[PDB]
Paper text:
The results clearly show that this protein has all properties of genuine α‐actinin. The R. argentea α‐actinin‐like protein dimerises in solution and thereby can cross‐link actin filaments. Based on these results, we believe the R. argentea protein represents a genuine α‐actinin, making R. argentea unique in the plant world.
In order to characterize its structure and function, we synthesized the gene and expressed the recombinant R. argentea protein. The N‐terminal actin‐binding domain (ABD), with two calponin homology motifs, is very similar to the ABD of any α‐actinin. The C‐terminal calmodulin‐like domain, as well as the intervening rod domain, are also similar to the corresponding regions in other α‐actinins.
Residue numbers in the entry: 37 to 275
The structure:
């Protein structure tokens, strides 16, 4: 009973601020891959309902070919396409704990964001191996190692450790010192630091601006899934 709401709490999906952060961040992440297939989404709670761009997203990030999709106005075609997506994901050793094609075709916001996170996790994070840690803990360890020389960075988590922008700027500076005047930065202007990292990463590293500095600024504890999504692109660009 209320198993789904317990999982949604931990997913961040009951908090509307975290839901909004995931909606915005996940849309940019999906488009950072769909661009390679010359298309895009606009509204993540509408534009996957027929399964077509979901299947395409999975082909791009996996390099594999999925079965041919159906087309037709009628719902059962959309259900079939979403099920082809879900089958492909499950085939990569993913436990789809209560994600059904019907809710995706229905455009249920929480299930759709949960599904996109499942995809980000499996394909962008799960295989990360850093020392003896894997997946999310490996990604966090990478961040801790790469930012260890910076005295004004202390990465403990994927939320408030990232709020003042210095950790993002440090990750960039550690790989490319010529792009960031790191010593000029301080904790006093977090929005400046955040936007610096986001602008530099978009310009020089081809990493789109998945995070909104204003959403981070106003949150005492920003959404972990959104921040992990963005940092996963840092990881795969440098490592």
């Amino acid at each position: 009973y209320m198993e789904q709401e317990e999982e949604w709490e931990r997913a961040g999906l009951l908090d509307p601020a975290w839901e909004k952060q995931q909606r915005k961040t996940f849309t940019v992440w999906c488009n950072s891959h769909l661009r390679k297939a010359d298309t895009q989404i606009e509204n993540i709670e509408e534009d996957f309902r027929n399964g077509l761009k979901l299947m395409l997203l999975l082909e791009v990030i996996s390099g594999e070919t999925l079965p041919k999709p159906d087309r037709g106005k009628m719902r059962f075609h959309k259900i079939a396409n979403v099920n082809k997506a879900l089958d492909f994901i499950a085939s990569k050793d993913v436990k789809l704990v209560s994600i059904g094609a019907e809710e995706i075709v229905d455009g249920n916001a929480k299930m759709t964001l949960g599904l996109i996170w499942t995809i980000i996790l499996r394909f962008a994070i799960q295989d990360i191996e850093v020392e003896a840690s894997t997946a999310k803990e490996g990604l966090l360890l990478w961040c801790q190692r790469k930012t260890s020389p910076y005295k004004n960075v202390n990465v403990h988590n994927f939320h408030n450790s990232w709020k003042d922008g210095l950790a993002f700027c440090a990750l960039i500076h550690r790989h490319r010192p010529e792009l960031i005047d790191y010593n000029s930065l301080t904790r006093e202007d977090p929005v400046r630091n955040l936007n610096l990292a986001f602008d530099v990463a978009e310009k020089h590293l081809n990493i789109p601006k998945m995070l909104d500095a204003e959403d981070i600024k106003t949150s005492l504890k920003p959404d972990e899934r959104a921040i992990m999504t963005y940092i996963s692109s840092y990881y795969h660009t440098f490592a």
